[PDB]
């Protein structure tokens, strides 16, 4: 609840840059953020993590 | 071990003598001498950041 209260109460003059770690349903979380604020967001994701580990 | 004893010498010796010799700090710096370290939120913060400094 801590993150949500800040995100709703946070004003519209700040450009947030969220940095998660491969969250599956990130294509609508930023949709909700981009709809709560009159602002446009972009989503970037990658594959093939380096330094492979077993 | 000389590097450990000099970094710890400039780290720990910045406070009063009564606080300088306590069971937690001697019992952790002793195991640090051998190259070990225990890290959890139940230890002093000044002793907390010493371990990650050495790591």
């Amino acid at each position: 609840v801590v993150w949500e209260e800040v995100l709703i109460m946070l004003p519209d003059h700040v450009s947030i840059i969220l940095l998660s770690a491969t969250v599956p349903n990130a294509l609508e979380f930023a949709d909700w953020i981009g709809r709560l604020k009159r602002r446009q967001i972009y989503v970037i994701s990658t594959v093939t993590r380096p330094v492979p580990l077993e | 071990k000389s590097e450990i004893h000099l970094f710890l010498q400039r780290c720990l010796a910045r406070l009063r003598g009564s606080d300088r010799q306590l069971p937690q700090v001697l019992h952790m710096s002793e195991l640090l001498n051998r190259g070990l370290g225990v890290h959890h939120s139940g230890i002093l913060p000044i002793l907390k950041e010493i371990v990650e400094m050495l790591f």
């Binding site: 969220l18 491969t22 970037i44 | 990650e52």
Partner: protein, 99 residues
């Protein structure tokens, strides 16, 4: 729509042809996604990142941090754990400025 997933290869065709003036240089080479985010961040855009390596995502974070002192503004870094909260402070203390 408010949500645009940029393709992993489509947007980037060049990186140094645009942004004629320099930026926060890195000793190593920047990856495609770091330059992809840097291109958008210059336009004061909102960026979401989903990757695996930890410090790889921090490149755009310190890009924004270095960009603030050229704008005289302030930035807030949130770390929901005590060990990581001070490591970034230590990393950026000797690196530059005041944190």
């Amino acid at each position: 729509q408010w949500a645009i997933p940029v393709d992993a290869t489509s947007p980037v065709g060049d990186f140094y042809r645009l942004i004629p003036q320099p930026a926060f240089q890195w000793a190593f080479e920047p990856d495609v996604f770091q330059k992809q985010a840097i291109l958008h961040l210059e336009r004061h855009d909102s960026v979401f990142v989903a990757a695996h390596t930890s410090a790889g995502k921090t490149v755009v974070a310190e890009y924004a941090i270095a960009l603030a002192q050229k704008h005289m503004t302030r930035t807030i870094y949130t770390s929901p754990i005590k060990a990581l909260s001070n490591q970034k402070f230590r990393d950026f203390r000797n690196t530059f400025g005041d944190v």
